[PDB]
Amino acid sequence: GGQQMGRGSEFVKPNYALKFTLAGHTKAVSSVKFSPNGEWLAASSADKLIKIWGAYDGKFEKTISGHKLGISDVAWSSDSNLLVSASDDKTLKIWDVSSGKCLKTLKGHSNYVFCCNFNPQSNLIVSGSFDESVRIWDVKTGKCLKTLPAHSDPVSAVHFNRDGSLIVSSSYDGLCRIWDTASGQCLKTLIDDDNPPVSFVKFSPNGKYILAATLDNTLKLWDYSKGKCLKTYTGHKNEKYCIFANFSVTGGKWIVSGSEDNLVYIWNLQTKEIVQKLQGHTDVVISTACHPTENIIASAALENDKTIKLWKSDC
């Protein structure tokens, strides 16, 4: 599995090793995200709470409460000062991180809100729901700016590209779709050979590619411009849950994802070989996040486990 970087780094391999286990959620953990400034790690949970820990030392920071039901997803503003969370109570909430207070409650979805993201500028929030729609929301006012009749099944993931001009969404309907932020037009529907449910999607950091997980145990790298699947990553287990995947970019070039056999998988992005599997969790690893500047992975597991783990590597 060796990966080529610069001279004398011809065969780089990651060596992620467990550094902290973060206990305190009382149900399944649903989503972990590092603050873009790298200082914090937030985890949402089916226990209706968001918790924040220090990303480097694993020290408990705060619990943020007020949703009436479980939280499926959480996302940071670009300045690390706000969180948005997506809840079974049909709302999103915007939080002031420093105070822990709810700033806005975004109402409009008619079923569970399952996924959320700020755009890079962080004036907007995008959401996907069991109501089969993608919504775009004004952060400052609270208003739903657009409701996109996006899919014919629950929306599994939503994500803006590097400049915010595009949203990618995914759905158990088998489709990945790309939407013009400004017009709300569907620009593209991407789908392969076969039509398994699409359980996760996100743009690459440069916005040129799309990583999509499908519930047939497959992650795929797509070129957005050409509509072509370039790479496939397999060997992990994903047939049931909406599991987050990631580009890891701070050391070697890896794809990182959770798996239903309780492991974190890490693949060489270029050759598609598995380079590492991280043991430790005792239930499905539903979420992984890659730290924005250090080789740090956060992982989180479902009901039988209830922990987040922080893992560190030399590359």
UniProtKB/Swiss-Prot annotation:
Annotated consequence of substituting F114L: Strongly reduced affinity for histone H3
Outcome, altering L302A: Abolishes histone H3 binding
Glycyl lysine isopeptide (Lys-Gly) (interchain with G-Cter in SUMO2), cross-linked positions: K27
WD repeat placement: 24-63, 66-107, 109-149, 150-189, 193-234, 237-277, 280-314
Mutation effect (A28E): Strongly reduced affinity for histone H3
Residues in coiled coil: none
Effect of F244A: Strongly reduced affinity for histone H3. Significant decrease in interaction with KMT2A
Intrachain S-S bonds: none
GO MF entries: histone binding; histone H3K4 methyltransferase activity; histone H3K4me1 reader activity; histone H3Q5ser reader activity
PROSITE patterns linked: WD_REPEATS_1 (PS00678), WD_REPEATS_2 (PS50082), WD_REPEATS_REGION (PS50294)
Name of a matching Pfam family: Beta-prop_WDR5
Task performed by this protein: Contributes to histone modification. May position the N-terminus of histone H3 for efficient trimethylation at 'Lys-4'. As part of the MLL1/MLL complex it is involved in methylation and dimethylation at 'Lys-4' of histone H3. H3 'Lys-4' methylation represents a specific tag for epigenetic transcriptional activation. As part of the NSL complex it may be involved in acetylation of nucleosomal histone H4 on several lysine residues. May regulate osteoblasts differentiation.
Protein's name in the database: WD repeat-containing protein 5
Organism: Homo sapiens
Biological classification of the source: Eukaryota, Metazoa, Chordata, Craniata, Vertebrata
Gene label: WDR5
